[PDB]
Each structure stands twice: as structure tokens, then as C-alpha cells.
Amino acid sequence: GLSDGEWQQVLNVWGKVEADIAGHGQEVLIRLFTGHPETLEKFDKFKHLKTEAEMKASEDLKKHGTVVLTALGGILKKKGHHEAELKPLAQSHATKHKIPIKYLEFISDAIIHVLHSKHPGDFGADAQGAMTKALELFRNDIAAKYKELGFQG
Ligand code: HEM
Ligand SMILES: [O-]
């Protein structure tokens, strides 16, 4: 898992996100949808967003980015002890939303990108390593639940 030091870096980075949760969440989803338009198709409520300008102008997209990063933050603050928090998300994303684990890889990559973009020169090599490890742990634990359920997508 992650060391004590590594969790400290994760939660330090997370403080940056928390100062503007909606702004970070918006930019994460925009990066996901523009880089991987197939992901937009999983959201009936964002399918009407035909341009990045429309995406930026959508208050509902910001609202969802808030929901998404708030959930992730709750999970990260558990420092790996997140079975209760993670299980329902795994189950809704596999059985209801039909989200392949590839799409979680995409959003993980989008979070790293957004952190650099919003905090250029203030997201150090150690911090990137730690955040990357935490997102991998999150994805790996979801993947285990996906395997239980026989879900591929
Ligand atoms: C950091 C990873 C993610 C987190 C923490 C997360 C969290 C959430 C939460 C808390 C909800 C609302 C409750 C629920 O339905 O379980 C939700 C809904 C949803 N999620 Fe995610 N999600 C993540 C990644 C993704 C990805 C990558 C996609 C698609 C590419 C996706 C698709 C959806 C959809 C389609 C909904 C329902 C949206 C609606 O209200 O119409 N999720 N997610
Ligand atoms: O989501």
C-alpha cells in the first residue's frame, strides 16, 4: 500500500483541490470528455454538450464534478481503509452506469493532468508519485469488485 509519508503527500495535494472543488471537478470532467468522447455517452445528462464552450458554461457539469471529487476525497481520507465507501461506487458504476475500468484509468490520468495544469511547478515529483499510487489503489480495489460481478463493459 502507501506509506505514512505518501498518504501525507496525498492529503496535502488534496488540500489544493478542496480550495476550489467545483473548479477542479469541472476541469477533470472536461479533460475526460474531450480526451475520450465515448465517456460523454455514458452520461445522458451531458450528451447535449457538443462543444467545450458548452461544457464550460454548464453549471450542472460543475455540480457533478463536485459530487465526483467529494466522493473521491472521502475515500482518500480513509487512507486505504475504504471498503464501505468504495463497494457501493463499484457496484453502481458496474451494474447501473456500465463504466469500464478503462474509463477509471482515463479519469485518474485526467486528475494528474488537471493538478499540473492548475498548479504548475507546485505539484512535485514526490506528490505526483503519491497521488498516482493512491488513484491506482482506488482503481485496483474497484477492479476487484468488478471481477466479482463479472463486469467488463
Ligand atoms: C474518481 C472516480 C469516480 C468517482 C469518485 C465517481 C463518483 C460518482 C458518484 C458519487 C456518483 C453519484 C452516485 C452513484 O450513482 O453512485 C456518480 C454517478 C455517475 N457516474 Fe461516476 N464516478 C467516478 C468515475 C466515473 C467515470 C469515469 C464515469 C464515466 C466515464 C462515471 C459515470 C457516472 C455516471 C453516468 C453517473 C450517473 C450520472 C447521472 O446523475 O446521470 N463515473 N459517480
Ligand atoms: O461520475
Swiss-Prot record:
Its EC number is 1.7.-.-, 1.11.1.-. One of its GO terms (cellular component) is sarcoplasm. GO terms for biological process: oxygen transport; removal of superoxide radicals. The keyword Magnesium does not apply. It catalyses: Fe(III)-heme b-[protein] + nitric oxide + H2O = Fe(II)-heme b-[protein] + nitrite + 2 H(+); H2O2 + AH2 = A + 2 H2O. O2 binds at H64. The keyword Heme applies. Heme b binds at H93. Monomeric. Monomeric heme protein which primary function is to store oxygen and facilitate its diffusion within muscle tissues. Reversibly binds oxygen through a pentacoordinated heme iron and enables its timely and efficient release as needed during periods of heightened demand. Depending on the oxidative conditions of tissues and cells, and in addition to its ability to bind oxygen, it also has a nitrite reductase activity whereby it regulates the production of bioactive nitric oxide. This is Myoglobin. It comes from Equus caballus.
